[PDB]
Amino acid sequence: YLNHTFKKVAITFDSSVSWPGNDRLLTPNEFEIKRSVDGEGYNVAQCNMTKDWFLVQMLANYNIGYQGFYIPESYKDRMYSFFRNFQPMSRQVVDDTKYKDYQQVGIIHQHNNSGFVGYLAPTMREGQAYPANVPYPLIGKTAVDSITQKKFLCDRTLWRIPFSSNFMSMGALTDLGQNLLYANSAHALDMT
Amino acid sequence: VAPTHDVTTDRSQRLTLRFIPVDREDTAYSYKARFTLAVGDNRVLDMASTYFDIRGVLDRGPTFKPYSGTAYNALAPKGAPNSCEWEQNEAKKTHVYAQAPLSGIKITKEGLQIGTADATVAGAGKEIFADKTFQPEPQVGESQWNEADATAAGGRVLKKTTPMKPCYGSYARPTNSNGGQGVMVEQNGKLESQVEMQFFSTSTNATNEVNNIQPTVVLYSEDVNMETPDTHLSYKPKMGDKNAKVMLGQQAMPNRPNYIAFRDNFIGLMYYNSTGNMGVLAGQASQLNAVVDLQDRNTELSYQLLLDSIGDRTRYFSMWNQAVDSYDPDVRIIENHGTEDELPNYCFPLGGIGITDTF
Amino acid sequence: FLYSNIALYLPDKLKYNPTNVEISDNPNTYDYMNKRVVAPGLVDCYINLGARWSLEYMDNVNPFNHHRNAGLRYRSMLLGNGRYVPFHIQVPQKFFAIKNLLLLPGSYTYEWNFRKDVNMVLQSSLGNDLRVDGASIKFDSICLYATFFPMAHNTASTLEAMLRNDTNDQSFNDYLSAANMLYPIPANATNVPISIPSRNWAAFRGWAFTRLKTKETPSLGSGYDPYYTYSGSIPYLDGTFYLNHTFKKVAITFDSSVSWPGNDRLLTPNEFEIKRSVDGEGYNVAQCNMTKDWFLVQMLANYNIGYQGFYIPESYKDRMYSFFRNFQPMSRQVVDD
Amino acid sequence: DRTRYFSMWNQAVDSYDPDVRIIENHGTEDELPNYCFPLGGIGITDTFQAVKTTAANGDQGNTTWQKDSTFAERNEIGVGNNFAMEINLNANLWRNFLYSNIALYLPDKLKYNPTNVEISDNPNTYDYMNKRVVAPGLVDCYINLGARWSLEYMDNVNPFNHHRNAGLRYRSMLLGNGRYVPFHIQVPQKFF
Amino acid sequence: DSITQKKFLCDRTLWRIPFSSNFMSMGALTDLGQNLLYANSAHALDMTFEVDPMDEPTLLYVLFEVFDVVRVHQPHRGVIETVYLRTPFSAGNAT
Amino acid sequence: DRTRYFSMWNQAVDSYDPDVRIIENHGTEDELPNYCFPLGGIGITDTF
Amino acid sequence: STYFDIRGVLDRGPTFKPYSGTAYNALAPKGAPNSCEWEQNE
Amino acid sequence: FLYSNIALYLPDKLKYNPTNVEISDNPNTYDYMNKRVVAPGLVDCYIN
C-alpha cells in the first residue's frame, strides 16, 4: 500500500552510462514517475504520472502499446495485475492568494449543524441554530476562486523493469542477458 | 529463449515523437490546426498509436451541482428558523424569538462574566467576561440532561435588518479570523465590530414585584451576510419581503442535482462526415488529399459499436474518458414488493423516564 | 426513494407553478425545472402494488438523462467538484480508413479542426441550453504525440520494399457500413409511406430502423446550429434508444407490384405484424404482444437460431448491444369499468 | 447456464438468498445517537420583557428600567440544551429484518394459539398459518453473535419455499397482481 | 373485477431485416445479393410504416446495410493513394 | 482464481471495501421529511 | 497429496470482540439510567 | 457510516487523550486504542 509514493529512480553501470543509453526516453539521465508542476505536460489519464512510465509498464506487463492502448483481455489481467490497481483522482479547493476574504479557521472555532449534535465528542446536542461556516461554496452564482490538484492511487502490485531491448516479453530468457558485449565480462552496479 | 538478434537497432533513435502545430486559426465556433508530420528514413510507423493532446480551461456554468441533498445544517428540522426579531405596530415595536444555549456565572453591568483569572500578588482573579467577537458560541451548552437551569445565561441573534431565512440550508462566510460570523463595517477602517449587548429579565418580574427588575439573560445582537446557494423556499406565506411574524414559518428544499461533463469518447469534439470543415492528410509532395468522406458516413455510431464488438464494455478506461451511459433497471421498471412493517419502532425521552411524580 | 427517483423526472404537462415564488418563463433554464413542482401522492406506495411493471408515462422519457448514471457520475467526478477547472486530456483518431493504416517513410501534411460550442462538447444530466447559463471554455495549446518501434534497419528496409509494391496494398472497411436516411414524422401522425425511384439493387444486405425525437437531433452540414437547444445524451451518436415499442407494422413492395416475402412464408403474407393489438387469433408468444413471426425473424437474424427450437444464446457470442439482452415483457391488472 | 432467465419457457429455478438461510450477525454501527426534534425546533419557552439598564451613576448594575419604549413584553425565549427525543436506527432495522425473514417460518410446534379470535381447526388452511403468534424473543437481535451458523430449529425446514425466492416472484409477477387472470402460454415436449 | 394489460419494452438496440431468402446469417454476403434478378436491372422501391401515435414531432431513422470499402497503396516514397467505394449509390465523378 | 474460498488450506485472500479506500459524495434524497407521532395520535386535547 | 495434521488448544485472549455494536439492551437510550437509589447529605 | 468506517482509524497523532478516566501508557495496548477518542467533525458529510 505504498508504491505510489516513489519519486524517481536512476541506474548506472561502472559510473559510466545511464542505462537506456541511446535516447530511448524523454529524460535519459533519470527515470520519472510523477511530477510537480509540468510545463511539458507529460501526465496522462488526468493523473500526474509521466506517460513514458505508463508505456513502460503496459509493455512490460502485457506487450501492449506500440500500436495504441486499450483495455487488456480479461484472462491476462490477473488478480495482482497492474491495471486492476490504478485509480487517478483529483479535486479543487479554495485558494488563499487570489481570494480576499479567505480565513484560516481551526477546528475549535467551527460550527455546522450547531444545536443538533455534540461538540468535539458524540454526546447529546447543544447550541442554537445558525448558518455554518466550514463548508465553503464551490457551485452556484457566488462561488470562490479555486486551485486544483490531483494524485493517483495504486497498491497491491509491484513496480517492475525488464532488461530488454524494447521491454517486451519475447521469451523467458531475455536477449540482452545473452549479448556477449554485456554477457561475457564483469561490471559493477549503482542505483539511486 | 528469446530471438537472438536482428530485432533492435543500436544507433540512437527516439522512442516517442512530439510535434508542434505549424498552423492554427480560430473562428466563432471552431478552430483549425495543421501539422507537418515526418516519417524518417528507415523508420516505420503505425497510425493507431497517434492521438492529440489538448489542454485548456473551462467553467461548467453556475448550475453545475453534483451532490443531492445539501450541506448547510442538514439535520435540522425543515421548519424551525434561526433566532431573529422583527418589527410590528400596535407606532412600532419589536418582537423577538431566540434561544440561549450557555449558562454563565453572574451578570455584570457590561457583559456576562464567564470565568475568573488566577489570583496573584494583589491580583485576585479579575472577573473575566465574554468577548463580543465570539465569546458566545453557537454550539456550547450544558453537558448532560439533568441541567440545573442556572440563573444566568446567554445566546445571540442578529438584527432585524438582515432578511429572515430558515436554518436548514443556511450559510454565512466567516469574517473574524478565529471563527466568528459578523459583518465588519468601516469606521476609519474595518476596526468596528458593531455588536450590541441587550439584557433581559422575566416578564412578570419586569412588570411589578417586590424588587427592581433583575435581568437573567444576555443577548448579543450582530449582523452578517446571508445566502442559501443550494436551497430554495418551498412554501411562501406572503408574496412580500420585509420579514414579519408570519414569515417565521418559511421553509425550503434543496435544488436538484446537476451532472454536466464531457460526453463519452469525446464524441463531437472533432468534425466528421460534414463537407464544411473536411480534414486533410496528404504527402507534402503535392496538394493531393487522401481523406475523402461523405455526408452519411456516420463514423461516430459505427466506431462506438465496433469498440463494443471487440471486448467487454463494463470497465471504464481513463485514458480517453471511456465509459458508457448506465441506468439502474429498477428506476425504469419497479418491483414493488412492499416492505417489512413488522414490530414497530419507538423514540424515548433522553433520560428514559417521561415524568416522575414526587411521592 | 420512489418519490425522488421517479417523481422528479415526469413529463411537464403534470407540473404547475408555485404560488408567491417568481419563476422564469423559459421552458429550458435550470431554475424552471427546479422550481416547478409536482404532487408527491401521485406516485406513492399504493401504485400497481405487486407488479414487475413500469409506469405509463415513463415509457416515453429519455432514461439515460438522469442522475443514477454511474457512468456520468464517473466522468463528472473525474473532473472534480467545481465551477471552474482546467484540463489536460487526450483524444484518439476516429476515422476508419486511416485508423490502422500502416505508414511509410516520407513527409506528410496533417490537418484537422474542432468545435467550440458548449452544447456539443458538453452533455448535462438534466438538459438545458448551456449558452444561456454561460458555461465557458478555452483551448490553450495543442501538441501532437506518437510512438515508434526500435526495429532493425535491414529488416525495416526489407519490409518497406516488400510493402511498397502495388501487388500488396492495404484494404479497409467500416464496421457498420450502412447508408443512413432520416425522415420526419409530424405531430400526432401515424402513417408514413416512403418511396425510392427505380435503381439497381446489386449487393444489398437489409435494413435497420429506429425512431428519434426531433428535438434531440442536431442537423448535419452546418458547422453550428444557432437554433439548437438540448444537452443530454444524443441517440444519433450514443446508441441509446427507447421508441421501439412505437413500431406497429411495416410492408415492402417492389415496382408497387410484389410483396417482398413473396410466396407463403409467414402468417401474414403481406407485412411484418410486429405487435398485434387485442385480437383473438392467438398469434403472440412469451406473454408479450409480439407476433411469433417477428420474434422468430429477430432470433434467426441475430443468432441463426429458430429452426431447431429455442434456447438461450451464448454469453460470449452475445453482447451488450444485443436484441435478447434488452428485451422485457410485462403484464398488469387494472380496474374494470 | 441456469442463472439467466427466459420468459416463454418459464426459465427460472427457485433460489434462496444465502444469508437468509445462514446468518452472519455482526451488529451495527451505533456510535451516534439519532435525535428527532419538535416541528418548531425549540420546544418550550417562557415569556420575557426587554429591560434597558439604568444610568447607574452608582451601585445600579443590574438596576434597570423597563425598555417598553421599543419592545413588546410578550417575548418568547428558551434556555438550556434544547428538548428533543432519542432513537437508535440500524439496530432496529436489523432486528425487524431478522424477526420477519427468519421468525415467521419457525417449526409450528413452538408457536402457541392466539386469544379472542377464531383460528381454523384444519392445520393447513391459510388462515391457520396467518393466525398463530410466535414469540420474537427467540430470534432476538443478540442471537449467537459473531457466529457463522444455521438455526438447527430452522434446519429440516424446507428453505426453498419462502417469500424471497426470485424465481417464484418472477413466475408470479409474470401474471400480474390479481385474481381473475387469463393466460396465453406455450409448453415444450419434454420426453427424451 | 377487472381487465388485463400486457406490454413490453426493448431498448438500446435496433431491429433488423436481412436480405436473405431465409432470414439467416449464412455469410457476410447474401445469396440474393448475388442472384441475377436483383442484380441486372433497376427496380422501384416502396415501403409502408404504421406506428403508435405521439405528440411532439419525431423522426424515422433508416439504415441500409451495404459494403463500404477502401483500397490504399503507396507507389514510391512519400506518396499515398486512396480509392474508396460505396456499393449502390454514388461518389466523385465518372466523367 | 483467488476470489473464492476454501476451508481446506484456510484459503481466503483478504481484501477491502472499494468505497472505503476512496469515498464518494452525492448527499442523498430527502425531499420528503419523516415524522413520529403520539402512540394514540392526538395527544393534547381539551374537555368539551 | 502429503500434508501435515496438527490438533491443539488455543486461547484468543481477553481482548477479543468479534461483532460491532453491543449486545445488552441494544435499544436502550444512550444515557438513560436504570432503577437506582443513592445517598446524600441532609 | 462515515464516522465509524473512516474516523475510527485515523493516525494516533490527530486524536487526543480522554479526561477524567483511567488510561494505559503503552501506545499499542488494546485499551489504549479503545479509550482514545477523536472529534467526529473531521469526516462529516460536509466534506469533500
Ligand SMILES: [Ca+2]
Ligand atoms: Ca408558561
